[model samples]
Target: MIPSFAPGTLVWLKQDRFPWWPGFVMDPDEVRDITLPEGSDVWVCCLPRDSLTLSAANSEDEGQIRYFLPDRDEGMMEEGKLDASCAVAIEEAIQLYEEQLKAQAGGTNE
Candidate 1:
């Protein structure tokens, strides 16, 4: 059976030196299976995340959104690439999203 990701699972879509771009799994059902160059069927998702800024006049991003898949070497989420610091950032992002939803619903925006 194919391993599945639950909603709100954090992931690192890229391998960067620092400040790696992070994405949250909004919906596990929003996924697609593809055959890689090495003949591996991998499930990927076009998850979205906040933009990354490099400097005042520059920004480094693959796009507004990126596709992420389970790491083959780890056989799970990109925990090897992401650290505890990354988890903190992911939690913050999730909290921000929740706040936005509450505001839209006319609830306490705090």
Candidate 2:
């Protein structure tokens, strides 16, 4: 069952990489959202070298999008060590994208 959250809601993605093994799991939280665009091939892109996962809905009500690390690795993403460093890397990527968007918007006054 999918967890309940509104569309466009940014939620922390927490994955248990090691699955109940003490000190072996990665429980890092990175912000992500769900999207469904109209009249296009349904697909998602992991921005910034597979650091961020985007899932686009493929069908109405019957299909939902998700982000999985194992699937990400299958899609040619190298798995990094799940540690504080990795968390920083993910957060940095998010910030970098935000800055890029800001720059594209003709520079922020503040």
Candidate 3:
């Protein structure tokens, strides 16, 4: 069960952080075999919601790879390692994270 996740979904990827990382999820449209066994390692095409723009991803920040697209880092990523999102948005993805990440610190590690 791939959790019935559809493309254009906002989800928290585990490969980005301990509990979860913020990013929108995309189906590997470039690949086939969408159906696989449950509990199997699933791929999640991800781009940093915080990097939707060509900025530091924060205030007074500088970087090389800004205004980018989702990478295949999660191609080998675990299936149950991530969580779905609803709050993250396209226009709001960048600015919203700026403030949220400033005080972002919490997890249900239990």
Candidate 4:
């Protein structure tokens, strides 16, 4: 059965000139180290790892494989931040009763 280096094990990818992005590891049954030619610079069936439930890398990622949740990075709050705003309770029946009483008594200051 499946041993170490299993799939659905959480994966993140990165680019060479910028920051890293998201992905999930999978496809342990796929072959490896089959670097075709090993000298060409094309999409010759990448030999690193393959056969995930997702489309393989569009281009190429050299050292981008991250798996951390929190790192206190700047501006991260602007995208997805901790919960803040929520609902508040209010009594409508009591307010309606007070309004009825005021109408019956003909209170000043309409």
Q: Considering every candidate listed, which one attains the maximal lDDT?
A: 1
Candidate 1 residue-wise lDDT, 1-110, digit = tens = 22233444445554455444555544323333432233222222223333432111112334343433433534234433456545455456557656655676677543
Runs off by more than 4 Å, candidate 4: 32-62, 69-110
Each model's C-alpha lDDT? 0.41, 0.33, 0.35, 0.35
TM-score, per-candidate, Cα-based: 0.33, 0.28, 0.26, 0.33
Q: Which stretches of candidate 2 lie over 4 Å from their true place?
A: 1-82, 108-110
**Winner on lDDT (1 vs 2):** 1
Output the lDDT of residue 93, model 1. 55
Identify the superior model by TM-score, candidate 2 or candidate 3.
2
lDDT of 4 by residue, 9-89 (tens): 333455577454334343434324333333322121111224422434322434656552232344234212532210000
- Residue 36 lDDT in candidate 2: 35
Comparison by TM-score, 3 against 4, better one:
4
**Pairs of colliding residues, candidate 1:** none
Count of backbone clashes, every candidate in sequence: 0, 0, 0, 0
- C-alpha displacement of 38 in model 3, angstroms? 14
Model 1: CA > 4 A from native: 1-20, 23-76, 79-82, 108-110
The collision pairs in model 2 are none
